[PDB]
């Protein structure tokens, strides 16, 4: 029933792209024959969010016609999708998200969710450039926790950047600029890469366009290339 993530997706590409979300942990969800060890000795919170988003993903992978299968993690934590597919996962207090795409229509996917709340104390100066840390204030309404939106867009960038280059991207390795739609709750962002955009295959990564949205007290960001 959940469609919030769609508020930051390209509708014109919904043929090859599917999404599924949940706002909590439904009882009786289980891991999978090969996922159980990845979660074997983690505390309950980590357990449930891991199970729930992987249920969301398989729903979305089904809706694209792909039999269910384990989504293991690779070194550096990236989810492992069945061949031909790509996508992104996110979880936080109140939200579980999965977006999946078919390769030759979607280069890769990056999504992130945060509670639409101020950042904790020392955090906004470690993920923001001084440029961003001064300009963003002049692009969004006061009711917007823009430092949190910035944080959120940073990680969507990283999540879409990584499967393409398998290289680290720091919070200072991309500069992001925001604009807002007339609503004051949704808008656009652009991520300029401050380092070699060399990809594992194909043209470099320079600028990532994406969408953000404040919706139901969550922050949502998505990059789909
Ligand atoms: O927002 P979140 O911080 O919860 O996103 C976390 C997710 O990012 C994804 N992620 C972690 N490392 C990643 C990477 N290097 N590249 C892409 N996605 C990654 C993982 O799927 C993780 O979900 P899991 O650890 O539950 O599988
Ligand atoms: Mn999480
Ligand atoms: Mn996040």
Swiss-Prot record:
Kindly list the residue ranges recorded as spanning the membrane. Answer: none
Report which superkingdom the organism of origin falls in: Bacteria
Where is CoA bound in this sequence? 46, 54, 73-76, 90-91, 112, 155, 159, 169
Q: What is the required cofactor set for this protein?
A: Mg(2+)
Q: One GO biological process from the UniProt record? A: enterobactin biosynthetic process
A Pfam family per the record: 4PPT_N
Q: Which reaction does it catalyse?
A: apo-[ACP] + CoA = holo-[ACP] + adenosine 3',5'-bisphosphate + H(+)
Q: State the function annotated in the UniProt record.
A: Transfers the 4'-phosphopantetheine moiety from coenzyme A to a Ser of acyl-carrier-protein. Involved in post-translational modification of various type-I polyketide synthases required for the formation of both mycolic acids and lipid virulence factors. Acts on Pks13, Mas, PpsA, PpsB, PpsC and PpsD. Also acts on AcpM, the meromycolate extension acyl carrier protein. In addition, is involved in the activation of the acyl carrier protein MbtL and the nonribosomal peptides synthases MbtB and MbtE, which are involved in the biosynthesis of the siderophore mycobactin. Required for the replication and survival of Mycobacterium during the acute and chronic phases of infection in mice.
Name of protein? 4'-phosphopantetheinyl transferase PptT
